[PDB]
């Protein structure tokens, strides 16, 4: 079989026995024994910048495996879409939406 | 065939919903993956890249209205204080 | 007939009729999301059936009057 | 004289098993069920973090590996997270979500088998090509292997120049999606 | 002309527009605002 098959199987098997032996072992016993305030717009906008600056991010990675061939043009392109996605984080950084100053 | 199920999960997803406004989100997104899976599947079956890049915008616009509709969303449950339709 | 049949096979009994399915049909909006979507995939069915099943497009006519017929009458 | 046709098994080169894909669209299907029927906001979108990882997969399996990681750092890292996020914290009543189902099951027959019997004719023929039976038979090239690039180099390759149009689009698609859902939010100052 | 089985086509037009009809219906068992069930 394939090696990366194989080592998620044994990973998979390790985590098992390490469960056995709580579950065997260790003591068990049969007892196993309301309000609303807002929360902060903070915690939206920290996955918010996240979610945009990633996808961001993530398009340029094709850029850097293909530089040789991209050359002037995909550099410039590139930069062309640099400097849009910069003029918005800027944007965030002028009105401290992450709210942290 | 796995394509035409999921649209399928997705629209009935709109037809099993009188109160979840948050499940008609999470249905737009099944609806989105199904058709960028179709173009993913049929650009492997024509040698064709052009379909890989299609899928990858389909991408990046599906997280831009994620975060438009979150982003509504939370404004509406500001003055609300509920996300339930009085059904 | 001039303040009788000719009024009501006429202006007034068009008026009183429409006003009366333009309520009903003015009910079915309740301003729900989940109830609007429905509305959609009903209507983009509608004409998915029409396109594909090759009709007759007589068939297509008794439908809206069927249907218009219908939020003719209340309750 | 004997069969000029000869099939064998192959040994050291012998590629994945069919059988993993009918495992996980099966997988695929059974959690999209699970999203739409379940009463809680938060474990549907946890069986939609499991919906995405099947797909993902399924991609990688078939040797889409730059999209199907690109999906599962996207999807399960961010925009699922969000999710959470926003589940988390509004105050849900679980009563006021939920609806009685049954009374919905007669137009899901209807819904269900309409709209199949139409997209799944609408289909190309190797999306749906899966007794005699056909087999895929593929070669080797030369010419064309002289330089072979990973999927993310070819894509990368046309992405900022051919189709740089699309990037531009998508960029201020981004941008609009920054301004806008910070303007919608926050408090100015 | 052709004759035309009448009877054969009335079939054919009653199951057409009360299929549509029995999609219609379907529409009103969804949006029913009590636990009618399926079989309303
Ligand atoms: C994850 C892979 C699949 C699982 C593999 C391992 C399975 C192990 C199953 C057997 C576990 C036995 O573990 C044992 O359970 C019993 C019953 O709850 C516990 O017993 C405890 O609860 C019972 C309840 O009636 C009491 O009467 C008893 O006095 C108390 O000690 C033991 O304290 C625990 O040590
Ligand atoms: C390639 C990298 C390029 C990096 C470019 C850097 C961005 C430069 C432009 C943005 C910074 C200038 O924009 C400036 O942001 C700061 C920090 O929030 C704001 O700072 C002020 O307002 C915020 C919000 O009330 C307060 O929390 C803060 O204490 C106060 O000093 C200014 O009101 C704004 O004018
Ligand atoms: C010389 C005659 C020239 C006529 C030219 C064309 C005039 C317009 C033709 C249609 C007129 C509308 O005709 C009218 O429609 C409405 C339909 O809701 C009906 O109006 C009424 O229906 C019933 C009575 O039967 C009432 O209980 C109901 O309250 C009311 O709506 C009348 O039965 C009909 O007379």
Redesign the pocket.
């Known amino acids: 079989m394939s090696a990366m098959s194989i080592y998620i199987i044994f990973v998979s098997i390790i985590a098992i026995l390490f469960l056995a032996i709580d579950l065997i072992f260790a003591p068990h016993n049969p007892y196993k024994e309301q309000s609303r305030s807002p929360f902060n717009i903070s915690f939206f906008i920290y996955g918010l910048v996240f979610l945009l600056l990633d996808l961001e991010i993530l398009l340029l990675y094709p850029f850097a495996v293909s530089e040789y061939v991209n050359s002037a043009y995909g550099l410039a392109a590139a930069l062309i879409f640099?400097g849009i996605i910069?003029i918005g984080?800027?944007?965030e950084?002028?009105?401290?939406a992450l709210?942290?100053? | 065939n796995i394509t035409l199920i999921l649209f399928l999960i997705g629209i009935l997803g709109f037809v099993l919903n009188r109160k979840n406004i948050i499940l008609m989100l999470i249905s737009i997104e099944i609806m989105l993956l199904s058709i960028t899976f179709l173009i993913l599947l049929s650009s492997l079956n024509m040698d064709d890249i052009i379909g890989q890049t299609y899928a990858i915008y389909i991408i990046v616009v599906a997280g831009a209205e994620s975060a438009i509709g979150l982003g509504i969303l939370v404004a509406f449950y500001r003055l609300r204080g509920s996300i339930a339709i009085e059904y | 007939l001039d303040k009788g049949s000719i009024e009501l096979f006429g202006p007034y009994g068009l008026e009183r009729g429409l006003v009366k399915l333009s309520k009903n049909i003015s009910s079915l909006s309740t301003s729900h999301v989940t109830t609007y979507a429905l509305y959609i995939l009903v209507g983009f069915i509608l004409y998915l059936i029409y396109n594909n099943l090759l009709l007759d497009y007589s068939y297509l006519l008794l439908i809206i009057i069927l249907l218009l017929l219908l939020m003719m009458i209340g309750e | 004289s004997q069969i000029s046709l000869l099939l064998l098994k192959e040994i050291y080169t012998n590629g994945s098993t069919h059988i993993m894909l009918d495992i996980l669209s099966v997988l695929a299907v059974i959690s999209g069920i699970c999203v739409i029927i379940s009463k809680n906001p938060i474990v549907s979108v946890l069986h939609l973090i499991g919906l995405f990882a099947y797909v993902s997969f399924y991609l990688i399996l078939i040797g889409l590996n730059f999209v199907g990681l690109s999906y599962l750092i996207v999807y399960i890292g961010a925009v699922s997270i969000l999710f959470l996020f926003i589940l988390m914290l509004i105050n849900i009543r679980t009563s006021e979500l939920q609806s009685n189902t049954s009374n919905s099951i007669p137009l899901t027959i209807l819904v269900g088998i309409i709209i199949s019997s139409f997209l799944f004719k609408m289909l190309p023929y190797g999306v749906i090509i899966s007794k005699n039976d056909l087999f895929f038979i593929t070669s080797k090239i030369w010419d064309g292997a002289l330089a072979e690039n990973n999927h993310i180099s070819s894509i990368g390759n046309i992405m900022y120049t051919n189709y740089n149009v699309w990037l531009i689009l998508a960029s201020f698609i981004l941008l609009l999606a920054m301004v806008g859902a910070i303007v919608i939010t926050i408090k100015?100052? | 002309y052709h004759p035309k089985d009448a009877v054969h086509l009335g079939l054919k037009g009653a199951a057409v527009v009360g299929g549509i009809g029995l999609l219609f219906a379907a529409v009103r068992t969804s949006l029913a605002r009590k636990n009618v069930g399926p079989w309303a």
């Open positions: 640099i910069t984080f800027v944007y950084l002028g009105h401290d709210k942290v100053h | 100015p100052r």
